[PDB]
mmCIF file of C-alpha atoms in Angstrom:
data_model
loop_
_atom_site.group_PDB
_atom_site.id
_atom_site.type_symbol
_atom_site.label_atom_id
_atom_site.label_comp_id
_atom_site.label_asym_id
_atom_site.label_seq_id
_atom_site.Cartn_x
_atom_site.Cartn_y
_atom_site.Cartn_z
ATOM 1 C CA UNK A 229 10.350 2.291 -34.102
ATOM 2 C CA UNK A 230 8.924 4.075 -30.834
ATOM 3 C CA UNK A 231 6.082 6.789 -31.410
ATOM 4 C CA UNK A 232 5.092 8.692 -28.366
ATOM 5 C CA UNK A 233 2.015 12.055 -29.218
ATOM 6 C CA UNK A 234 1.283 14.344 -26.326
ATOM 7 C CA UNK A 235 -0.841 17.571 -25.973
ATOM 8 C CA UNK A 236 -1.698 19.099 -22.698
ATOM 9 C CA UNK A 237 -2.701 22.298 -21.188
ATOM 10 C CA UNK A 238 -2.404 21.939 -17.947
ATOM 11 C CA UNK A 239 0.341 19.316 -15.981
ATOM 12 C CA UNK A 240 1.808 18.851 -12.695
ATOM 13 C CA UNK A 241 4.487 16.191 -12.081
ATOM 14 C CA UNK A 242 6.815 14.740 -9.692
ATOM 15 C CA UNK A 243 9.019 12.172 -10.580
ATOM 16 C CA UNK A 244 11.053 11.252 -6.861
ATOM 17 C CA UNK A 245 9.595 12.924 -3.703
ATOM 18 C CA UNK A 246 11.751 12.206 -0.449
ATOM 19 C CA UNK A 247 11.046 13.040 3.232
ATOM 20 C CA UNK A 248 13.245 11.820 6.288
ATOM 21 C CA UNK A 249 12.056 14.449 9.862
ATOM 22 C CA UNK A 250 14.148 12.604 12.415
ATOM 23 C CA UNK A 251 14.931 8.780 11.065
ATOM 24 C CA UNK A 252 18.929 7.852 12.020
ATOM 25 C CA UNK A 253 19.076 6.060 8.369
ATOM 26 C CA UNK A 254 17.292 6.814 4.815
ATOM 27 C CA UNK A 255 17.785 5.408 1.917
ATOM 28 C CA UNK A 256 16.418 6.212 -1.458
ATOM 29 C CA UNK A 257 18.003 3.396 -4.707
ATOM 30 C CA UNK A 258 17.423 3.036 -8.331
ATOM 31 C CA UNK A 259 19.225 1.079 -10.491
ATOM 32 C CA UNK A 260 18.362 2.120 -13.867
ATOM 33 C CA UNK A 261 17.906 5.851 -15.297
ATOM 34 C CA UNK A 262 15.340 7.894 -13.418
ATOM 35 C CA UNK A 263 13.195 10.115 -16.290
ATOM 36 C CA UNK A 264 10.548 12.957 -15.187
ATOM 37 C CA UNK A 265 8.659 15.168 -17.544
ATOM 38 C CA UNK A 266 5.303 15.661 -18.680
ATOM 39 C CA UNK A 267 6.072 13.979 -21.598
ATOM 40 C CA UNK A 268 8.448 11.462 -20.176
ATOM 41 C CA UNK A 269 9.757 8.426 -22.324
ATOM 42 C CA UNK A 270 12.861 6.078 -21.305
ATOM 43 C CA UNK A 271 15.053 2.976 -23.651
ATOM 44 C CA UNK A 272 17.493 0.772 -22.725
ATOM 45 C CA UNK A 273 19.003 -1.963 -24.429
ATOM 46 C CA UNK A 274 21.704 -4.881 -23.522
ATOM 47 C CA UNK A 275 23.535 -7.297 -25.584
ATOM 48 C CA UNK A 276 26.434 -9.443 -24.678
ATOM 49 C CA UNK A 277 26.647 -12.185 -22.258
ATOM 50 C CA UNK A 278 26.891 -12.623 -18.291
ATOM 51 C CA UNK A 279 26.016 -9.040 -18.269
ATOM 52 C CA UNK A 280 24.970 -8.640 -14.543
ATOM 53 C CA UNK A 281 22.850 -4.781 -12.653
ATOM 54 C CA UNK A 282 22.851 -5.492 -8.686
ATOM 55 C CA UNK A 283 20.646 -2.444 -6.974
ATOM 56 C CA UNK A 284 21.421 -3.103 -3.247
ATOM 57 C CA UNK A 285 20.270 -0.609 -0.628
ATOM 58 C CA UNK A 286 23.139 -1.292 1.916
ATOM 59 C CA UNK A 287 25.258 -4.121 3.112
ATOM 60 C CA UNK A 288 26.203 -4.957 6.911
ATOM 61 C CA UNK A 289 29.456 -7.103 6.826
ATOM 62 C CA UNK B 104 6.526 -1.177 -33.035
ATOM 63 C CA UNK B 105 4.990 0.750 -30.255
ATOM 64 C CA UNK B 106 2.352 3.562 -30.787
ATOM 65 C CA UNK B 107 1.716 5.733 -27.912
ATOM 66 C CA UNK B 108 -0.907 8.726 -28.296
ATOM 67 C CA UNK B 109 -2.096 11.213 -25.106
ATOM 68 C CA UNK B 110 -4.367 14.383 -24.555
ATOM 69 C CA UNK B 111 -4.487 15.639 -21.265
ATOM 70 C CA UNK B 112 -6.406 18.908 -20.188
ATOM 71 C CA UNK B 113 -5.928 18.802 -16.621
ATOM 72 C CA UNK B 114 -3.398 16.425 -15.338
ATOM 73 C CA UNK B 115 -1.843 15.843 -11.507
ATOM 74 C CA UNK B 116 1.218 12.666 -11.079
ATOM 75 C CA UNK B 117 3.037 11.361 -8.582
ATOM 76 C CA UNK B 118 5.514 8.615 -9.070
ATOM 77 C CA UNK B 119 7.441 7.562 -6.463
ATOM 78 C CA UNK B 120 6.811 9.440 -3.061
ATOM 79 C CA UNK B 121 8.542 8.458 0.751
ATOM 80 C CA UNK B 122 7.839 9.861 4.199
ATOM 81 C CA UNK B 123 9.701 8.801 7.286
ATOM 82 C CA UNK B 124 9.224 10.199 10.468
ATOM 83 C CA UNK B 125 10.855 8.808 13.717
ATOM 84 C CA UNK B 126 11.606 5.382 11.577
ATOM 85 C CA UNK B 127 15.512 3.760 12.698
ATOM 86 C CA UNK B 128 15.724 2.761 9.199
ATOM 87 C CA UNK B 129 13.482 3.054 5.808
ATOM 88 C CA UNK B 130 14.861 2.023 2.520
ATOM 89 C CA UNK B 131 12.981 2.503 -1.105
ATOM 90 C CA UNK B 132 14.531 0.066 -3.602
ATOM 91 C CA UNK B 133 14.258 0.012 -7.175
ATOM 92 C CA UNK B 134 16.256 -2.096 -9.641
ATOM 93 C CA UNK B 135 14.870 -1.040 -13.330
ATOM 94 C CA UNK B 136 14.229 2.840 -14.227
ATOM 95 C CA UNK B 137 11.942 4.463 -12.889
ATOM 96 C CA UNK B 138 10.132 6.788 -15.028
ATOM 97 C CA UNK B 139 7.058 9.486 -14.341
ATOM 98 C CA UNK B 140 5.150 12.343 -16.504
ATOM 99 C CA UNK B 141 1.497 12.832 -17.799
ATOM 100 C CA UNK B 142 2.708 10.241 -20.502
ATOM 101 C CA UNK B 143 4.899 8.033 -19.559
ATOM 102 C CA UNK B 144 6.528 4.970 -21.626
ATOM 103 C CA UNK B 145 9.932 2.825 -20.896
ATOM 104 C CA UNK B 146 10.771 0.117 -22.752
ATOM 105 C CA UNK B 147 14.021 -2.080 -22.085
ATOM 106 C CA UNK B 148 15.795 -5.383 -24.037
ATOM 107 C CA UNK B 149 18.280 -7.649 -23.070
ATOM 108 C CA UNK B 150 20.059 -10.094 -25.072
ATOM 109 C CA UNK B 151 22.588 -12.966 -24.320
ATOM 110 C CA UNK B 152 22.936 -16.047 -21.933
ATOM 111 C CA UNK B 153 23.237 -15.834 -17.947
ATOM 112 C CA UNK B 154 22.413 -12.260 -17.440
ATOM 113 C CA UNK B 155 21.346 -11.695 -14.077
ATOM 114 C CA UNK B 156 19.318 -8.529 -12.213
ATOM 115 C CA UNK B 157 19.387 -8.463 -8.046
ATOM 116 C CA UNK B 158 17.624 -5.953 -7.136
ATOM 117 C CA UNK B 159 17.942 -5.991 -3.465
ATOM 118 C CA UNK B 160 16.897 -3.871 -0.078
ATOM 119 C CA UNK B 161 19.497 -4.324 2.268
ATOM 120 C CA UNK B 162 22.132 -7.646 3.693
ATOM 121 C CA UNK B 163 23.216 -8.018 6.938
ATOM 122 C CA UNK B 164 26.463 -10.271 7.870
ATOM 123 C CA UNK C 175 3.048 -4.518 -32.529
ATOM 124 C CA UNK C 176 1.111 -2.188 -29.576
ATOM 125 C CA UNK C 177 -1.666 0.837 -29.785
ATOM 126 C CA UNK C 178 -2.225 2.858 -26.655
ATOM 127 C CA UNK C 179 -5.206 5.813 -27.183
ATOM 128 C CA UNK C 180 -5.655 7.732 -24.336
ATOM 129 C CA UNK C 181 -7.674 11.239 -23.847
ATOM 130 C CA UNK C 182 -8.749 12.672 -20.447
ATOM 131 C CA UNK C 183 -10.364 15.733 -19.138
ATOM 132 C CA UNK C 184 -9.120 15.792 -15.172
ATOM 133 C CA UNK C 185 -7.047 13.021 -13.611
ATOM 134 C CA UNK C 186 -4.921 12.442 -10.829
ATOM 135 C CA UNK C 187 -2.638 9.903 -10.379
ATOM 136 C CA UNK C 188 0.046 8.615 -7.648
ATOM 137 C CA UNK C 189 2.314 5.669 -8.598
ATOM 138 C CA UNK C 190 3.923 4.526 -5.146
ATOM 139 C CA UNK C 191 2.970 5.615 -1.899
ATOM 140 C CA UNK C 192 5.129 4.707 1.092
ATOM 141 C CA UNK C 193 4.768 6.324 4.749
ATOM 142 C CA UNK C 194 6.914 5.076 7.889
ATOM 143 C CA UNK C 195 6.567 7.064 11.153
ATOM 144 C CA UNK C 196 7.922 5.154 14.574
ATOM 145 C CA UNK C 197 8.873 1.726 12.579
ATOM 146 C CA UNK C 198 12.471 -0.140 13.603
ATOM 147 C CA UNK C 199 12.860 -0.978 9.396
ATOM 148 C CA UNK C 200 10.316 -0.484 7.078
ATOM 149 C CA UNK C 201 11.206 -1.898 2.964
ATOM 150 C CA UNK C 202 10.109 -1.066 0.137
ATOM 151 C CA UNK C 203 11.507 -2.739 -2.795
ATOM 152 C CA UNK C 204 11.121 -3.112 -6.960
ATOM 153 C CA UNK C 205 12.592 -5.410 -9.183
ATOM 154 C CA UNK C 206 10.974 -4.728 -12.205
ATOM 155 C CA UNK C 207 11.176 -0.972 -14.080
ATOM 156 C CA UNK C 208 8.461 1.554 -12.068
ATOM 157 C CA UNK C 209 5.809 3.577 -14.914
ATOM 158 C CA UNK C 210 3.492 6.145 -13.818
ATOM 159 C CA UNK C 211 1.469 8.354 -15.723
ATOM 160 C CA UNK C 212 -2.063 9.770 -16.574
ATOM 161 C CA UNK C 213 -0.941 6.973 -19.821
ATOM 162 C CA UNK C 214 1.456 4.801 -18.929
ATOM 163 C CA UNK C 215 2.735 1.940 -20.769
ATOM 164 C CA UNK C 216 5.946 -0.549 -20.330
ATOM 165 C CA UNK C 217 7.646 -3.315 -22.331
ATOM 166 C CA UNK C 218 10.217 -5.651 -21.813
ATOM 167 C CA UNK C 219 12.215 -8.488 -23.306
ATOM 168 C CA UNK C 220 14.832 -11.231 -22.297
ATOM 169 C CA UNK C 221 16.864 -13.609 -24.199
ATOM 170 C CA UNK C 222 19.065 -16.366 -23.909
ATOM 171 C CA UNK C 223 19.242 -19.272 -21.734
ATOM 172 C CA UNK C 224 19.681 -19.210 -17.782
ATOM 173 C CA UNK C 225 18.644 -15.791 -16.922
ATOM 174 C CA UNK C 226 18.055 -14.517 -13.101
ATOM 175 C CA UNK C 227 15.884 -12.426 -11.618
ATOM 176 C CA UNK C 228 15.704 -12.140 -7.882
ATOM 177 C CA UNK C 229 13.836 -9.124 -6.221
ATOM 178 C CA UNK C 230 14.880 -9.765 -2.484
ATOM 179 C CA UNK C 231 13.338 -7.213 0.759
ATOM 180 C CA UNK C 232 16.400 -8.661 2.744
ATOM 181 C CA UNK C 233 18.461 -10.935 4.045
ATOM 182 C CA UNK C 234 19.945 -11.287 7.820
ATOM 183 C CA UNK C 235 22.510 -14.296 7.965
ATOM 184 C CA UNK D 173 -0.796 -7.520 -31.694
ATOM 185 C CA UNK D 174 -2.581 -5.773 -28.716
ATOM 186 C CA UNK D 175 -5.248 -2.465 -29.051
ATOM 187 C CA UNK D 176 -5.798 -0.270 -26.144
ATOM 188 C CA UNK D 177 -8.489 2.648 -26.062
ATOM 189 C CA UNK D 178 -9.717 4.705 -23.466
ATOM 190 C CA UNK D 179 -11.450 8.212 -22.368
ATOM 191 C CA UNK D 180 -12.180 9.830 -18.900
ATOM 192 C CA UNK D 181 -13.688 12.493 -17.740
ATOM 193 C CA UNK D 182 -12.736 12.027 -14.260
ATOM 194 C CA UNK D 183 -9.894 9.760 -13.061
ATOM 195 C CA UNK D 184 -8.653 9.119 -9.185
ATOM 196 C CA UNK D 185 -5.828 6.064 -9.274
ATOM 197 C CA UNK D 186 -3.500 4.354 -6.923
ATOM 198 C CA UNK D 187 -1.105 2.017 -7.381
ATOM 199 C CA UNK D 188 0.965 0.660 -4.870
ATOM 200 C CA UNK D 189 0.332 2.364 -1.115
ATOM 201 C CA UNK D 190 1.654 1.498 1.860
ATOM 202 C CA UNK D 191 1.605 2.652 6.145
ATOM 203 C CA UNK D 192 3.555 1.880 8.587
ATOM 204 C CA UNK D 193 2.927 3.460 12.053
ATOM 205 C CA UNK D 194 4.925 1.331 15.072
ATOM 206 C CA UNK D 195 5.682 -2.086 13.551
ATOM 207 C CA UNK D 196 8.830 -3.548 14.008
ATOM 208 C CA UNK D 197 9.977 -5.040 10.168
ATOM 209 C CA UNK D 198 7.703 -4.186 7.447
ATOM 210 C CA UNK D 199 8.358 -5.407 3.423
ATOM 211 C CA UNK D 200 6.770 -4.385 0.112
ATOM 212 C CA UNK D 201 8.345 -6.962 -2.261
ATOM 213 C CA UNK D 202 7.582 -6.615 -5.736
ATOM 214 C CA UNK D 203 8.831 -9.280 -8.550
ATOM 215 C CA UNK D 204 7.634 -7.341 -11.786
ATOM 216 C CA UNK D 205 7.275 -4.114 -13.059
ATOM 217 C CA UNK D 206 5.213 -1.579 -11.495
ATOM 218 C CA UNK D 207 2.565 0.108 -13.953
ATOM 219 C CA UNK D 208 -0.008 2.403 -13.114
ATOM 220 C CA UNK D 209 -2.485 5.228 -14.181
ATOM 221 C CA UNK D 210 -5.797 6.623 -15.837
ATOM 222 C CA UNK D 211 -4.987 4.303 -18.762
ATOM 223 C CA UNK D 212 -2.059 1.066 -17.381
ATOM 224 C CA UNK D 213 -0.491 -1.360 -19.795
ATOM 225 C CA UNK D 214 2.309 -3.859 -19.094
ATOM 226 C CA UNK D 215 3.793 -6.655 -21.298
ATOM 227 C CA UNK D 216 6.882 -8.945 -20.998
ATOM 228 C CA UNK D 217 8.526 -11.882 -23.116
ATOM 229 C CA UNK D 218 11.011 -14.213 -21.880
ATOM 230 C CA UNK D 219 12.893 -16.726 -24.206
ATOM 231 C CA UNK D 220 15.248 -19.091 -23.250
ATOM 232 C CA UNK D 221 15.607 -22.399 -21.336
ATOM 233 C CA UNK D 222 15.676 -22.167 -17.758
ATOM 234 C CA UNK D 223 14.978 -19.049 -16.899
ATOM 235 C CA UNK D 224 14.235 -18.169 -13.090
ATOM 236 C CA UNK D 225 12.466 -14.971 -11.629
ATOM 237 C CA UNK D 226 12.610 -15.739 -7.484
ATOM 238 C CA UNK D 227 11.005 -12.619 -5.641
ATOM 239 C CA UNK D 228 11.144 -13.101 -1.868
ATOM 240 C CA UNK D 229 10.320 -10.815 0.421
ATOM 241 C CA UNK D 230 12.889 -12.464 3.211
ATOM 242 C CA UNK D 231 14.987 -14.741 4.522
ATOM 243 C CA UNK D 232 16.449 -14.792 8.490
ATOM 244 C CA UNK D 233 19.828 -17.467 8.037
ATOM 245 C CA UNK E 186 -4.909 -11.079 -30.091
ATOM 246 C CA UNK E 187 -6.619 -8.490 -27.601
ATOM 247 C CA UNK E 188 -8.599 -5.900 -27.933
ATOM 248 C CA UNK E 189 -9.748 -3.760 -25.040
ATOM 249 C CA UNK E 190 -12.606 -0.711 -25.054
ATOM 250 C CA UNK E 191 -12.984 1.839 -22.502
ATOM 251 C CA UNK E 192 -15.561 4.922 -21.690
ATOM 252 C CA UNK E 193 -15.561 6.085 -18.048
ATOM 253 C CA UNK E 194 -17.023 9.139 -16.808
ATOM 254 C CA UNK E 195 -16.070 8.800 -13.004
ATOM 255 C CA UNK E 196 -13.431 6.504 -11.863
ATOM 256 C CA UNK E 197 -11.684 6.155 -8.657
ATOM 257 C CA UNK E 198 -9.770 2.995 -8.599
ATOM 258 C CA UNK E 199 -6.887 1.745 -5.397
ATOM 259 C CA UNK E 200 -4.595 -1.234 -6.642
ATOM 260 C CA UNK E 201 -2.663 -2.682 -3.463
ATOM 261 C CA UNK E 202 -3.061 -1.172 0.151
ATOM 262 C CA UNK E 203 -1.384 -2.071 3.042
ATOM 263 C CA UNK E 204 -2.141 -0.635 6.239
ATOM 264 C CA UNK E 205 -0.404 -1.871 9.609
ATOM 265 C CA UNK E 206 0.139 -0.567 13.598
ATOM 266 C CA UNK E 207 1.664 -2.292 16.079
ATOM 267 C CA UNK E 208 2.372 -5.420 14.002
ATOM 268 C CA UNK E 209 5.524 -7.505 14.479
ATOM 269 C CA UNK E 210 7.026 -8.622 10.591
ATOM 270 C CA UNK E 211 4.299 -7.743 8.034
ATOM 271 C CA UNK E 212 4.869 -8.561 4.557
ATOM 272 C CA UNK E 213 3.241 -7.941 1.323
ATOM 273 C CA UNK E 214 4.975 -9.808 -1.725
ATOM 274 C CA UNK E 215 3.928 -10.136 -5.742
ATOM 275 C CA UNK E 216 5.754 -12.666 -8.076
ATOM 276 C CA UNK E 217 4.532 -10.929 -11.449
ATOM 277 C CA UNK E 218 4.027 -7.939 -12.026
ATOM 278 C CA UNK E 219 1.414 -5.376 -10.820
ATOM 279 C CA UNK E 220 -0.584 -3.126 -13.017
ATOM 280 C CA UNK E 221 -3.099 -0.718 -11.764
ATOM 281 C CA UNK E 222 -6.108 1.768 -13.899
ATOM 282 C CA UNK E 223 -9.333 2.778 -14.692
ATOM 283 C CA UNK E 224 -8.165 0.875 -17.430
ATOM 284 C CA UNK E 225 -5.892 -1.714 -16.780
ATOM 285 C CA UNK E 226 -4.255 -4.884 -19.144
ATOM 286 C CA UNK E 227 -1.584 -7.025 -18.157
ATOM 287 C CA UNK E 228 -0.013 -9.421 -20.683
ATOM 288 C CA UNK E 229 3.185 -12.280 -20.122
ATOM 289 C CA UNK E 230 4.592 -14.648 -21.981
ATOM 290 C CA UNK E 231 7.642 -17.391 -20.782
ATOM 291 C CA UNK E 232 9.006 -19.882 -23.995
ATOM 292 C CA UNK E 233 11.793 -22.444 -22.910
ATOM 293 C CA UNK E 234 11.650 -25.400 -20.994
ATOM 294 C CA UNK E 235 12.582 -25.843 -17.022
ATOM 295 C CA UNK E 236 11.464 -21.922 -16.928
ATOM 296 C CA UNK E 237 10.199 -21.535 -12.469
ATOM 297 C CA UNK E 238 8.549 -18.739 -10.808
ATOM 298 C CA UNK E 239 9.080 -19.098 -7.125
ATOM 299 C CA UNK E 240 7.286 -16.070 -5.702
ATOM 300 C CA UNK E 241 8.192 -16.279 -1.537
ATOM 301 C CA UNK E 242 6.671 -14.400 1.268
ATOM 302 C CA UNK E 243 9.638 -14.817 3.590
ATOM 303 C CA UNK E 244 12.209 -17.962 5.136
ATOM 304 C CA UNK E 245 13.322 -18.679 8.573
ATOM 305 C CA UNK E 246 16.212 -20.867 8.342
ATOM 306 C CA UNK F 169 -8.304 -14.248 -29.809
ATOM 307 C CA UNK F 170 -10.028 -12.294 -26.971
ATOM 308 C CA UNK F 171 -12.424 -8.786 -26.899
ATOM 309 C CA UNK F 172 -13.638 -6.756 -24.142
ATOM 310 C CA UNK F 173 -16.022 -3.879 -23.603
ATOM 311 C CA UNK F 174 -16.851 -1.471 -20.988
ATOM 312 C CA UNK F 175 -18.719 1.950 -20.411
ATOM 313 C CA UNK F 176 -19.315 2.914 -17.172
ATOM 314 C CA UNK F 177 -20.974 5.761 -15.525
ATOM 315 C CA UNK F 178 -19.201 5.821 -11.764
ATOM 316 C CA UNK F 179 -17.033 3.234 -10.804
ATOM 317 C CA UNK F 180 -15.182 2.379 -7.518
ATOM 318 C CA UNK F 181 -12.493 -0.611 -7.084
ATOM 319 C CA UNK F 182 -10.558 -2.042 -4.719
ATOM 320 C CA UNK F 183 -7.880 -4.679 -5.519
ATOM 321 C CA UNK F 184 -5.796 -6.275 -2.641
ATOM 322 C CA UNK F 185 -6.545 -4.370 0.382
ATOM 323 C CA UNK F 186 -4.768 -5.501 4.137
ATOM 324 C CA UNK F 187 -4.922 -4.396 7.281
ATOM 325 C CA UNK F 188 -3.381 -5.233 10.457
ATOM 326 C CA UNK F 189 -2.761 -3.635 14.024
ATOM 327 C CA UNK F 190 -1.524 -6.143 16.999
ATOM 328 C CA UNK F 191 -0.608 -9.171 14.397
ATOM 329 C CA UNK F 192 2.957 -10.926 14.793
ATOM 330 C CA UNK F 193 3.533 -11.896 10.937
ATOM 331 C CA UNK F 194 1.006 -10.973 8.512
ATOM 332 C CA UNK F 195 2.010 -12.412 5.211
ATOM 333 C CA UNK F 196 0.454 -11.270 1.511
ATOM 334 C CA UNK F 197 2.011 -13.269 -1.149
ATOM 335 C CA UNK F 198 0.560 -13.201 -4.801
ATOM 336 C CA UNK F 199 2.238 -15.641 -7.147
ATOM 337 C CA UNK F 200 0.938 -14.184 -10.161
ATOM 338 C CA UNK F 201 0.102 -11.119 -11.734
ATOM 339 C CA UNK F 202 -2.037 -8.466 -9.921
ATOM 340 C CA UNK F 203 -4.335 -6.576 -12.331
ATOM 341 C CA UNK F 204 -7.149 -4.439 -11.104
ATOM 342 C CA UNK F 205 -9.287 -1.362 -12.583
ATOM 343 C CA UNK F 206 -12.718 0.111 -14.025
ATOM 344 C CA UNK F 207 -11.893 -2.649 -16.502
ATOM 345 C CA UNK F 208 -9.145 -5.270 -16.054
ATOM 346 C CA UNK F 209 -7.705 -7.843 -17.883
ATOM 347 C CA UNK F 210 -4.917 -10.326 -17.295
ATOM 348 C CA UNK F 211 -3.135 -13.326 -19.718
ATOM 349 C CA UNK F 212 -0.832 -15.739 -19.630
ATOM 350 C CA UNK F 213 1.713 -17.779 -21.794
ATOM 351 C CA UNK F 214 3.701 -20.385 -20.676
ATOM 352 C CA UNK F 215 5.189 -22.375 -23.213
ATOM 353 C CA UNK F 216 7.847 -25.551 -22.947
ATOM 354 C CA UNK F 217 8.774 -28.638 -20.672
ATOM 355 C CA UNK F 218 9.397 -28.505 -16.900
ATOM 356 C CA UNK F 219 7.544 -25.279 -16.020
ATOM 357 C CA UNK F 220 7.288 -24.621 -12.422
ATOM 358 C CA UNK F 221 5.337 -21.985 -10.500
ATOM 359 C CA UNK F 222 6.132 -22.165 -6.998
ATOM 360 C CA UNK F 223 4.920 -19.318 -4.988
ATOM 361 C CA UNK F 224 4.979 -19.827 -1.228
ATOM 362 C CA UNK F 225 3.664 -17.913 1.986
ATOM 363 C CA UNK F 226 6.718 -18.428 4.306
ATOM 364 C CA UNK F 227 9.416 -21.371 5.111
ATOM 365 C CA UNK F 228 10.579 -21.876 8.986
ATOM 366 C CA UNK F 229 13.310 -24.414 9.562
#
């Protein structure tokens, strides 16, 4: 059981806010879900063994 | 059980923000969710043996 | 079992800041799940032998 | 069991902020979860033997 | 058991800053996790034996 | 068990604060949880044999 309750009148959000002007690389990840709202609620759940989540920015071989 | 309760006349959020100017390389990273609003809740479960998170920036080889 | 009251008139709120201007490689990075709000709450649970975590910036081999 | 109240009139927070104007390699590591505003709450439970959480912000091989 | 009680009328609270220039390799790392408010509660529990935190700045090798 | 009370008028916090500007490797490890606010609170349960908390600056082979 998960209760979220919310009033508002006034609300101003961002959630992800990316700049890059004149960098050669950018990089921006997430591994799990991104959620934005001004009532913003998220779940996950994971059952089963050797389960494996590996969020790399880059690799250089 | 989780009880979450929120009023909010005036309300101003920012949850993940990235400049990068002149910069050879920037990297922003995140291995769970990422989640952003006036109210904001995550929750996450997991269950079984060996499970494994990596959340990583970069690798060079 | 968790209560979280919260009321509030004006607020303001900013999660993660990053800024990079003439930098070779600037890193930021998050293992964990990223919550941001004028109320912001998170839970999490693991279970079951051997589990991993391991929130790395980088590696250069 | 854990009770949280809280009321503001005025609220100004920040989390995690970071510059970076000419340096060379720069890192924000962070093992956990990330939790921040007017009102912040974060809780976690780990069972099982063994269990490793590692958070580095490099290595150079 | 916890119970926490809060009643602000001006709050302006910074969790973690990092500022840096011409510096070389500068790192900021955190092993748990970081939480950040005018009203702020952090809360962890680890069952199981053998369980290590390991929490590393950085390795040259 | 544990209680805590606060009212405050005006308030103004700083947590972990850094600078640097000509510094070669400036290192901010934590290696536990960072908690700061108006009112803060951190705990801690580690239960079991063979616990190990190991957090470490740097490492140069």
């Amino acid at each position: 059981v998960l209760y979220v309750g919310s009033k508002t009148k006034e609300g101003v959000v961002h959630g992800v806010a990316t700049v890059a002007e004149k960098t050669k690389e950018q990089v921006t990840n997430v591994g799990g879900a991104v959620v934005t709202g001004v009532t913003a609620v998220a779940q996950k759940t994971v059952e089963g063994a050797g389960s494996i989540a590996a969020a790399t920015g880059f690799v250089k071989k």
